[PDB]
DNA sequence: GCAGACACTACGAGTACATA
DNA sequence: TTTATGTACTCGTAGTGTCTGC
């Protein structure tokens, strides 16, 4: 069995809070705090990707470079996060006695915390304000609306945002730097459009890519990672002249291999999210969206259910 | 018993002569009880198909198959929810309606046809408004009444039997009940004042009964015994026609949509039927009930009425796909406002 | 026998399954082999797929292993996810059933044994998806069959790995050696077009067919009278709507007159007629008609087809028949 | 004549095999040959493997004329010796092409035979020979001293990290709520032969082991009184308990580090 | 498995036991063999139809990887075993965790069908996948792409499986004919493709089932007429035959034509709709409506057939929407 | 719930020889039921501005950090009256920016918006505003603004909408299009979503068709009967109407076993 | 040695959520 | 009093096995 390299994703994580790129105000407050030292509870969340446990990881690193083993609670869904575990380890923690530096405090990180019981998040409630000059928590998320009001209210919310493309970019030439490869401007322009600001698909697409080719070509990229099916979907939606759409449905969608509740469903997204037409006409294509995902739910699926759709669709903005 | 309607009951094929060729049907599968295949009696409410089992069952067994007993069984379903259904049993059959809860009755049904299925040679089973079961528990009732044939039979009863699943009326031998003729209301209704003591002067009165029953001997009897106990036993020519509270107050709704077209209007319809679901009346008679009120009203015109049926059509769709009841008969008069 | 002709009747063996030969031949040449695949079998009720797969499992095991090789899971029994999960992978799990000197002298015991899954369309679809891998996995010592009124309800990997056995409809072409065979045995008397008129009051329903007939020489056998059956006593069994009121019913239609027609639809629901069979001779009278142009026939179609359509998911007879009728009145 | 009849003096003798690797192991299977019953599963979690081997001298008459492979559920097999008393004298019985085999508790105490019948299994898997000779520690202990520290040291973590250095064993099994270090030496118990502990070490061994399959692991020590790990690196710990004819020989995977 | 092979359906008599023998995927295969032999192997996630040979692709992969003894060596986890968020986080957690126990190298974790697991499995999957990547992949098959969690896909690289083309269906025919000593013909051929719709399980089933119609299976070919009576499906001819009486005939001719088609060989009415609906494909139709008109009324026509009724008044529907669609000036 | 210690905390208050204080957020749980009037209903409400500009005046004199007399308002209204997260806030602001202005002051709004999940009174009084589907009001409350809006209480929102469908003055009506045929408009896509509610809650337990059930429930009803209103936001009547209708039924079932 | 006293895994029943 | 399976969590429960000491 053959050895495995290690994967671009970590062998070029950051280490330190300026090494990631990103909500500019958000890392100079992190570094604040980092100098500082008071560090209040945080409750970090944003869409996947963009750099959330990282950075508590690197700030954490940087607060507690000599008692990180020590001072640090690194829990996620992968451990029993339940009420008894919760409250026997937690408790345990924010009890030891441990001669931290004057600035500095106890970090217990709970990573992706949307998933976490509602009981548990009650009891952590009274542990965070009972042990509170002594231990810190901090939250990484990818939705805040999970976590209960009062936890929000006894931390400080601090929300990321998608990194433009810019940041990408800059990023991805940082890695190129770093190891050495041939790359087209054109190959780079469509790793950054695939990734749709997903830092971590970005570095994903670029090592598949090299690896199977070895120049960041745009032919090579594409080959590598298909387009996307929201954008087709949408420029299925979009696109007057049904016939248009009929063939762009039995060509990019129905022949590549994509199955139909897939192709319901991002129709549905895309159609929810969308906002070139006005209200009613995207009330009304829901609906009949709506109407074939029950059908194909049901047991009927077809490529004429999806030409149905699409017929209906065009017929609502012909406006009959 | 005090009702005229129970104990004016035909106890066998020969009482009955209300249909001379179903009763000659009913004679011809009753004489070589040896191959009897599973019945499903269906028809209109109220014409008499439960007296008509009873009466093929007393032919076939032979007595006292009228003498049933009132066992109270316990079930299991889900989480800690205890349902307590009595089967109405008997000696030589038995009888099983969908009294318990519409969402769980394949557990009840399946684990009675079970035990029953283990102990002339055959034990009859009766499914009271067989119309009324989830499909699921009729998919369930298929194999259940197809291994077991020696051992257990089904009769099996059940009116608009449209919901009734293919595979079982494969299965099942299909009977029509029709329902009775003025001429029979009036000749049985007869036979009931003859018998009992009402001073009648004038067989109109009968007549009238008959047509207001709509082809419902049930109705039609209880329309007698409420009346007659009203007149002091001494029915007039000019009685006013006697209708159920449910009746009254739908035709009230129906006077209320057609004279007026308002939303302060369709608030009151909305309470008024928030108080009959309330009542238990099922809502798909009760948008039948309505829409044939609507359609008889001589101030609409006929287009009018052909968008009224459409969209009760297309609602009675709808409650038959729906589960609140009350959401699709609010769309249904809403759609009919807009109309007229 | 003590039986009804129903099950008095059923195919003991593959020979006597009429019709179905594709279905019939594949299985008969797959008994000499042993490389019988996961079966989907489907079709119309009454087709013929529990019959043709007792036979299979008699032709190949016989009454002996039977009862220790074969598992049959209906909706009598739970099938949600867990039994599923647990049952069917404990018993496909398990190793074959050792056949007996006698089996093994007569009968050619194949090296597996075969979970046979009645109504396999009424399944959830997470009980499908966690059967996909077990009929895949333990398949060189199992064999599935699936047994489903409905395609569409199984999911399309199951479709995929099953090997499908669509069973046609049989009508007056294909099974009327089968009633023939059943009226020569219980020697019933009947005319020459009396078995058609059976077959084709039936859809693909050959057990309809038969209660049918049963049920007609139960009535010659009460009135005694030594009388070949009609086709007036079959129809009138049957259900059958009599052709006087259908053209009564079309006779009302044509005249328009709502109120009318109404009432005559309020008389027609009072004689207790079942909508399923008077749609369909509405059908038959119409578009089969030649006084009727296009047009009539493009928009009476799709009327019937909308009515049969909603008379399908229950709904109250009555309002469905009358829309229909008005509406057709209104063309 | 059944070809399979392998008769067992001491029936708790087998009961006490099976319930040795009962909890780890679900499912195994038994290459009956000439030369015993031999048996290899490995663990849904693909960690733990359980070879074992029970010799000809084990059983008071052993004959078995073809290779045979008995696939089972080790739940109903465990239930099935729990069906008995120690007393007994059990029987394995399978014909040719088994579906099932006969277990026979017969006592000439008082006639109450009781026949019980399993139902076989096709787990259908080949695994391989063991492929690993040279270690680089090679210790013996006695199995209730190593119970007892693998017990004491699962409660305070989930690793238990086994040192070996010259003529010192160390255990160390540092956890959230503290830490832990047993520190053994060998000696020679003269009076007490069966306690005594063996070193031979080669080269330093420093690998860790999940806490609950080394429970697993010493929930055999009432097989035997002793029990040998012989470590290395880049190889399993090859748990060894002797038997009177065989042995049940556990390989256990370290966990990695980084 | 037991008595060998032979008694086994074509489907998994032949299981491609070699990437080189998977064919119809070219990409795929050829990417996944540089990342093996180049040494990265990157988290994979396998997606597409049925029948395109994903998990006979990861099989042959972890076959190819370790060797003869992948079975004990990767932990494959169905839908048929339990999968659930104590499964994620005690099995896959301490096999993840530990050495290899029979050799050195990775541990390989194929979660077959993965699109079968709750949400909060996935959650709990995605901080075992992010931790011990170091030395042990993760590789996901999936049917269905939205049952999984964008941070599930995010972890993971993309690899779309594509319907299998002709030539591969063709050649594994082939070759499936040179083992078996069977002889077909390229109308049957041709017949086959039609019939596989991307899933060469279906080419298998029907291939194994048209040999057991032969009388003799040597001496004997598979021409047209063996495939669409052992598979009961509609001839070309007769699906044009039926479309032009459609749509020139009269009602009563064309449902006389319709009928005695149906009743011919007990065509079932879906199977014409669908190849009605392929036909109509290639019309060129100048009227927008009457594309609307026909997808519309022949979707209804399926959603009908599949919850089931009456087939004379669906066929006389067909006709009639046909009729209809094509009334208004093409 | 059951046996999750509410009764025991209710025979506590009917029996104990201490003064007993309990601390909840809020009383519309089905849970609290139990005590409805067995315990005192003294109550808390959002503090008023002074109170809190002083005491946050006091606290930036006390970490010499500048805070300017008229940001603190709306620092207040982001914050909904949650003072430990202003004061998290003002903290977690001055570690890197001790000076606050109307120059920053939008910028640590949209940043620090608190975000509460709405009552259930609510969700029905923004959805029924025909402000958010005007032009302007879907650019700035998108569609997928709404469906989060209708999933923040998914249970009771779908019934919220219809019991008040039709007593909204409405003000989003089509030229030509009359009140009566918006509300029919309405009631026809509740009847449409009440037949996808049941798919979801049926043995099949398709709950994928959630966001179609916002669709069909909530957000297409209610743009159609946009406007001010005629009163205030009706209570769920379903419910009560539903029990009465239970019992009814037992009633029936009950007197049907006794007459036979 | 026997009977308890303990901690232990295991089983049963009930609440809660289910798309971003 | 509502939904109606499957999943996950939480609890108290009853056996089950092991160590102390009369
Ligand atoms: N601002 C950034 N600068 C540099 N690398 C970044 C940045 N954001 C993300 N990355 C890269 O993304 C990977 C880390 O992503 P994560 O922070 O683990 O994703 P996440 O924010 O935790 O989102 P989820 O919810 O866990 S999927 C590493 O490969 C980083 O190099
Ligand atoms: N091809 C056939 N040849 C002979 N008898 C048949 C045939 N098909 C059906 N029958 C008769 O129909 C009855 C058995 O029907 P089944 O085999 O149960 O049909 P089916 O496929 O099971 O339909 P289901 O399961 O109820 S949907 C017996 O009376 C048989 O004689
Ligand atoms: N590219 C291919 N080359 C050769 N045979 C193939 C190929 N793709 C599929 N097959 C055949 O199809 C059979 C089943 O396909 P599998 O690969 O096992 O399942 P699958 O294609 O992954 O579909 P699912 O989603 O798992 S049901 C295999 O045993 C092969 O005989
Ligand atoms: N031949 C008959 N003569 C007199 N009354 C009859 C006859 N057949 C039926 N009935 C009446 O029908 C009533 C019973 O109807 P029932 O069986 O409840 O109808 P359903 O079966 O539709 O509920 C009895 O009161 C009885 O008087
Ligand atoms: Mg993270
Ligand atoms: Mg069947
Ligand atoms: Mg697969």
């Avoid at chain 1, 070895?214 to 299925?236: E, Q, R, Y």
């Amino acid at each position: 069995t053959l050895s495995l390299q290690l994967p671009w994703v970590e062998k070029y994580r950051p280490q330190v809070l300026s090494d990631i790129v990103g909500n500019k105000e958000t890392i100079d407050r992190l570094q604040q705090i980092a100098k500082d030292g008071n560090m209040p509870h945080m409750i970090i969340s944003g869409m996947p990707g963009i750099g959330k446990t990282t950075s508590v990881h690197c700030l954490a690193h940087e607060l507690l470079g000599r008692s990180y083993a020590d001072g640090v609670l690194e829990l996620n869904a992968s451990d029993d996060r339940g009420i008894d575990v919760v409250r026997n380890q937690i408790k345990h923690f924010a009890q030891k006695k441990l001669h931290l530096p004057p600035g500095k405090h106890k970090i217990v990180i709970l990573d992706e915390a949307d998933s976490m019981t509602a009981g548990a998040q009650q009891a952590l409630r009274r542990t965070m304000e009972l042990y509170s000059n002594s231990t810190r928590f901090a939250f990484a998320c990818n939705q805040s609306n999970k976590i209960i009001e009062p936890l929000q209210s006894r931390c400080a919310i601090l929300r990321y945002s998608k990194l433009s493309d810019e940041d990408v970019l800059k990023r991805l030439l940082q890695i190129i730097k770093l190891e050495d490869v041939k790359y087209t401007n054109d190959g780079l322009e469509a790793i950054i459009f695939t990734a749709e600001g997903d830092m971590r698909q970005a570095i994903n697409n670029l090592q598949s890519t090299v690896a199977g080719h070895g120049l960041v070509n745009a032919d090579n990229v594409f080959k590598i990672v298909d387009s996307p099916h929201p954008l087709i979907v949408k420029k299925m939606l979009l696109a007057s002249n049904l016939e248009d759409s009929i063939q762009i449905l039995r060509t990019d969608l129905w022949k590549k291999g994509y199955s139909s509740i897939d192709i319901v469903t991002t129709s549905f997204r895309v159609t929810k999210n969308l906002a070139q037409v006005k209200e009613s006409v995207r009330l009304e294509m829901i609906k009949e969206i709506g109407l074939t995902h029950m059908r194909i739910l049901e047991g009927v699926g077809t490529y004429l259910q999806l030409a149905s759709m699409l017929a209906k669709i065009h017929k609502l903005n012909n406006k009959a | 018993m005090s009702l005229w309607v129970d104990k004016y009951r035909p106890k066998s094929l020969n009482a009955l002569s209300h249909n001379e060729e179903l009763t000659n049907f009913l004679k011809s599968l009753s004489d070589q009880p040896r191959d009897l295949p599973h019945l499903l009696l269906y028809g209109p409410n109220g014409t008499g198909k439960k007296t008509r089992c009873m009466a093929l069952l007393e032919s076939i067994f032979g007595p006292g198959v009228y003498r049933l007993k009132i066992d109270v069984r316990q079930f299991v379903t889900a989480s800690n929810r205890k349902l307590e259904l009595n089967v109405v049993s008997s000696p030589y059959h038995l009888e099983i309606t969908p009294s318990d809860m519409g969402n769980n009755d394949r557990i009840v049904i399946q684990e009675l046809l079970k035990e029953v299925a283990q102990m002339h040679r055959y034990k009859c089973v009766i499914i009271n408004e067989a119309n009324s079961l989830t499909k699921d528990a009729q998919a369930a009732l298929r194999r259940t009444m197809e291994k077991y044939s020696k051992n257990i039979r089904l009769i099996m009863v059940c009116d608009s039997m449209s919901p009734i699943i293919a595979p079982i009326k494969s299965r099942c031998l299909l009977i029509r009940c029709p329902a009775p003729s003025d001429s029979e209301i009036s000749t049985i209704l007869s036979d009931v004042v003859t018998n009992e003591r009402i001073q009648l002067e004038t067989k109109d009165i009968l007549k009238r009964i008959a047509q207001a029953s709509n082809g419902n001997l049930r109705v039609s009897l209880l329309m007698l015994e409420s009346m007659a106990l009203n007149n002091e036993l001494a029915l007039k020519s000019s009685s006013p026609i006697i209708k159920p509270d449910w009746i009254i107050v739908i035709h009230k709704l129906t006077r209320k949509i057609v004279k007026e077209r308002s939303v302060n209007s369709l608030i009151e319809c909305r309470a008024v039927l928030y108080d009959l679901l309330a009542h238990c009346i099922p809502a798909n008679i009760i948008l039948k009930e309505l829409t044939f009120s609507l359609l008889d009203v001589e101030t609409l015109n006929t287009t009018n009425k052909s968008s009224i049926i459409e969209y009760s059509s297309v609602f009675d769709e709808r409650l038959s796909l729906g589960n609140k009841a009350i959401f699709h008969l609010e769309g249904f008069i809403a759609k009919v406002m807009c109309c007229l | 026998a003590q039986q009804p002709w129903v099950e008095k009747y059923r195919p003991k063996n593959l020979d006597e399954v009429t019709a179905q030969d594709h279905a019939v031949t594949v299985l008969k040449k797959t008994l000499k082999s042993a490389n019988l695949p996961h079966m989907l079998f489907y079709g119309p009720p009454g087709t013929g797929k529990t019959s043709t797969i007792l036979a299979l499992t008699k032709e190949l095991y016989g009454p002996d292993l039977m009862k220790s090789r074969i598992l049959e899971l209906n909706a009598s029994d739970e099938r949600g996810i867990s039994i599923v999960r647990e049952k069917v992978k404990n018993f496909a799990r398990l190793t074959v059933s050792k056949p007996s000197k006698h089996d093994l002298e007569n009968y050619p015991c194949p090296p597996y044994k075969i979970i046979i899954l009645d109504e396999a369309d009424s399944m959830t679809a997470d009980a499908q998806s966690a059967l996909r891998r077990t009929m895949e996995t333990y398949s060189g010592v199992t064999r599935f069959c699936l047994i489903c009124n409905y395609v569409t309800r199984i999911i399309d990997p199951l479709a995929s790995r099953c090997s499908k056995f669509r069973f046609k409809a049989l009508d007056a072409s294909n099974a009327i050696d089968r009633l023939r065979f059943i009226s020569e045995q219980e020697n019933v008397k009947c005319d020459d077009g009396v078995l058609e008129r059976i077959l084709d009051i039936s859809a693909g329903d050959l057990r309809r067919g038969i209660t049918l007939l049963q049920s007609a020489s139960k009535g010659a056998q009460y009135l005694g009278d030594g009388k070949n059956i009609t086709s007036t006593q079959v129809e009138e069994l049957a259900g059958v709507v009599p052709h006087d009121i259908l053209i009564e019913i079309v006779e009302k239609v044509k005249s328009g007159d709502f109120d009318e027609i109404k009432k005559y639809v309020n008389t027609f629901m009072k004689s207790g007629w079942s909508a399923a069979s008077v749609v369909n001779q509405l059908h038959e009278y119409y578009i089969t008609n030649d006084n009727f142009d296009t047009n009539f026939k493009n928009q009476i179609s799709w009327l019937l087809f909308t009515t049969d359509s909603r008379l399908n998911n229950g709904t109250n007879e009555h309002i469905q028949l009358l829309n229909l009728l008005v509406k057709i009145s209104q063309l | 004549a059944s070809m399979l009849e392998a008769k067992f003096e001491e029936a708790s003798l087998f009961k006490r095999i099976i319930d040795g690797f009962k909890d780890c192991v679900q499912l195994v299977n038994f290459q009956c040959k000439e030369d015993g019953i031999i048996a290899q599963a490995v663990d849904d979690s693909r960690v733990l493997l359980v070879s074992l081997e029970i010799g000809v001298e084990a059983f008071q008459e052993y004959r078995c004329d073809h290779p045979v492979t008995l696939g089972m559920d080790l739940t109903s097999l465990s239930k099935i010796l729990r069906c008995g008393n120690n007393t007994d004298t059990l029987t394995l019985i399978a014909d040719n092409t088994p579906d099932s085999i006969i277990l026979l508790f017969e006592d000439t105490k008082k006639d109450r035979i009781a026949e019980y019948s399993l139902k076989l299994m096709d787990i259908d898997a080949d695994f391989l020979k063991i492929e690993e000779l040279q270690y680089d520690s090679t210790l013996s202990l006695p199995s209730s001293e190593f119970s007892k520290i693998v017990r004491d040291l699962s409660q305070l973590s989930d690793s238990i990290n086994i040192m070996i250095t010259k003529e010192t064993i160390k255990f160390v099994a540092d956890g959230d709520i503290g830490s832990g270090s047993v520190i053994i030496k060998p000696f020679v118990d003269m009076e007490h032969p069966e306690t005594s502990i063996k070193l031979e070490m080669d080269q330093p061994v420093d690998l860790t082991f999940g806490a609950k399959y080394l429970l697993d692991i010493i929930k055999g020590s009432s097989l035997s009184d002793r029990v040998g790990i012989r470590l290395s690196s880049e190889a399993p710990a090859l748990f060894q308990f002797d038997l009177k004819s065989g042995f049940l020989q556990f390989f256990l995977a370290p966990k990695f580090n980084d | 498995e037991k008595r060998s092979k032979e008694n086994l359906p074509w489907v998994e008599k032949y299981r491609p036991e070699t990437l080189d023998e998977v064919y119809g995927q070219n990409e795929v295969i050829t990417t996944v063999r540089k990342f093996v032999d180049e040494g990265k192997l990157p988290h994979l996630l396998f997606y597409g139809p049925p029948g395109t040979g994903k998990t006979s692709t990861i099989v042959a992969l972890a076959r190819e990887i370790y060797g003869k003894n992948y079975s004990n060596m990767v932990l494959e986890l169905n839908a048929s075993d339990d999968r659930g968020i104590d499964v994620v986080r005690n099995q896959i957690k301490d096999f993840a965790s530990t050495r290899q126990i029979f050799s050195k190298g990775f541990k390989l974790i194929i979660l077959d069908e993965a699109d079968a697991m709750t949400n909060a499995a996935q959650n709990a999957l995605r901080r075992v996948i992010e931790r011990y990547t170091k030395n042990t992949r993760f590789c996901v098959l999936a049917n269905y792409a939205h049952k999984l969690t964008p941070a599930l896909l995010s972890r993971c690289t993309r690899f779309r499986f594509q319907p299998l083309p002709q030539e591969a269906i063709e050649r594994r025919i082939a070759n499936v004919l040179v083992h078996e000593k069977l002889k077909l013909s390229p109308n049957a051929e041709k017949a086959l493709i039609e019939l596989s719709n991307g899933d060469m399980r279906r080419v298998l089933n029907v291939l194994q089932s048209c040999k057991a119609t032969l009388d003799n299976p040597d001496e004997d070919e598979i021409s047209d007429d063996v495939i669409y009576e052992c598979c009961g499906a509609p001839r070309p001819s007769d699906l044009k035959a039926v479309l032009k009486s459609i749509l020139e005939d009269d009602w009563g001719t064309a449902h006389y034509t319709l009928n005695k088609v149906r009743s011919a060989k007990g065509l079932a009415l879906i199977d014409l709709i669908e190849g009605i609906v392929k036909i109509l494909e290639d019309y060129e139709l100048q009227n927008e409506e009457t594309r609307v008109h026909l997808l519309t009324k022949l979707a209804d026509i399926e959603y009908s057939i599949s919850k089931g009724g009456n087939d004379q008044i669906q066929g006389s529907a067909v006709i009639g929407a046909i009729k209809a669609s094509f009334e208004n000036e093409t | 719930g059951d046996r999750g210690g509410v009764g025991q905390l209710a025979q506590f208050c009917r029996k104990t020889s201490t003064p007993l204080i309990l601390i909840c957020n809020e009383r519309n749980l089905p849970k609290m039921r139990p005590f409805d009037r067995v315990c005192l209903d003294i109550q808390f409400r959002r503090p008023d501005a002074n109170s809190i500009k002083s005491r946050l005046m006091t606290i930036a004199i006390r970490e010499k950090f500048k805070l300017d007399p008229n940001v603190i308002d709306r620092l207040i209204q982001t914050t909904r009256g949650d003072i430990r997260q202003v004061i998290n806030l003002l903290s977690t602001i001055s570690t890197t920016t001790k000076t606050i202005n109307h120059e920053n002051i939008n910028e640590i709004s949209k940043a620090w918006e608190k975000n509460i999940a709405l009552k259930p009174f609510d969700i029905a009084h923004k959805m029924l505003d025909g402000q958010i589907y005007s032009d302007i009001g879907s650019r700035n409350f998108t569609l997928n603004d709404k469906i989060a809006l209708y999933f923040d209480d998914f249970d009771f929102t779908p019934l919220m909408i219809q019991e008040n469908y039709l007593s909204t003055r409405p003000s989003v009506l089509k030229p030509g299009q009359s009140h009566l045929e918006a509300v029919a408009e309405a009631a026809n896509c509740i009847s449409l979503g009440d037949i996808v509610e049941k798919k979801i809650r049926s043995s099949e337990q398709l709950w994928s068709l959630l966001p179609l059930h916002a669709v069909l429930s909530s957000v297409y009803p209610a743009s159609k009967v946009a406007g001010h209103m005629a009163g205030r936001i009706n209570f769920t009547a379903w419910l009560g109407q539903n029990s009465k209708s239970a019992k009814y039924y037992r009633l029936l079932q009950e007197i049907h076993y006794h007459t036979r």
